[PDB]
């Protein structure tokens, strides 16, 4: 009886640069802003799921 | 006249063989600075330099 199992895997990552998003005073896209304005104050699963 | 004979024989043979081999290798690289094409060339894990 002879058994030979060999798994040699490599995961190499070379990062170009890092990015950090701002936390305050974020300007949203006009489409997302319209969609937010188009959401009613009453709970509606359809519109929220679409969003 | 009376003639009688007796014979007996036995043979035993046992063989055992064991072979075990193991080898592993690891590599760790940590480079900071100039993440351009040349450092990607140097990021070659197989060749050391």
UniProtKB/Swiss-Prot annotation, chain A:
Location relative to the cell: Secreted; Target cell membrane
Protein family membership: Belongs to the complement C6/C7/C8/C9 family.
Self-association and partners: Heterotrimer of 3 chains: alpha (C8A), beta (C8B) and gamma (C8G); the alpha and gamma chains are disulfide bonded. Component of the membrane attack complex (MAC), composed of complement C5b, C6, C7, C8A, C8B, C8G and multiple copies of the pore-forming subunit C9.
Biological role: Component of the membrane attack complex (MAC), a multiprotein complex activated by the complement cascade, which inserts into a target cell membrane and forms a pore, leading to target cell membrane rupture and cell lysis. The MAC is initiated by proteolytic cleavage of C5 into complement C5b in response to the classical, alternative, lectin and GZMK complement pathways. The complement pathways consist in a cascade of proteins that leads to phagocytosis and breakdown of pathogens and signaling that strengthens the adaptive immune system.
What disease is mentioned for this protein? Complement component 8 deficiency, 1: A rare defect of the complement classical pathway associated with susceptibility to severe recurrent infections, predominantly by Neisseria gonorrhoeae or Neisseria meningitidis.
What is the name of this protein? Complement component C8 alpha chain
**Organism source for this protein?**
Homo sapiens
> Which gene underlies this protein?
C8A
Where in the full protein does the shown chain start and end, and how long is the full protein? Answer: 283 to 333 of 584
Curated annotation (Swiss-Prot), chain B:
Which cell locations does it reside in? Secreted; Target cell membrane
**Sites bearing Phosphothreonine, chain numbering:** 22
Question: Could you state what the record's PTM comment says about this protein?
Answer: N-glycosylated; contains one or two bound glycans. Not O-glycosylated.
Coiled-coil stretches: none
Quaternary structure, from the entry:
Heterotrimer of 3 chains: alpha (C8A), beta (C8B) and gamma (C8G); the alpha and gamma chains are disulfide bonded. Component of the membrane attack complex (MAC), composed of complement C5b, C6, C7, C8A, C8B, C8G and multiple copies of the pore-forming subunit C9.
Q: Which family does it belong to?
A: Belongs to the complement C6/C7/C8/C9 family.
Q: What disorder is listed for this protein?
A: Complement component 8 deficiency, 2: A rare defect of the complement classical pathway associated with susceptibility to severe recurrent infections, predominantly by Neisseria gonorrhoeae or Neisseria meningitidis.
Q: What does this protein do?
A: Component of the membrane attack complex (MAC), a multiprotein complex activated by the complement cascade, which inserts into a target cell membrane and forms a pore, leading to target cell membrane rupture and cell lysis. The MAC is initiated by proteolytic cleavage of C5 into complement C5b in response to the classical, alternative, lectin and GZMK complement pathways. The complement pathways consist in a cascade of proteins that leads to phagocytosis and breakdown of pathogens and signaling that strengthens the adaptive immune system.
Give the protein name, as stated in the record.
Complement component C8 beta chain
In its UniProt entry, the species of origin is given as: Homo sapiens
Name the gene for this chain.
Answer: C8B
Part of the full-length chain shown = 397 to 445 of 591
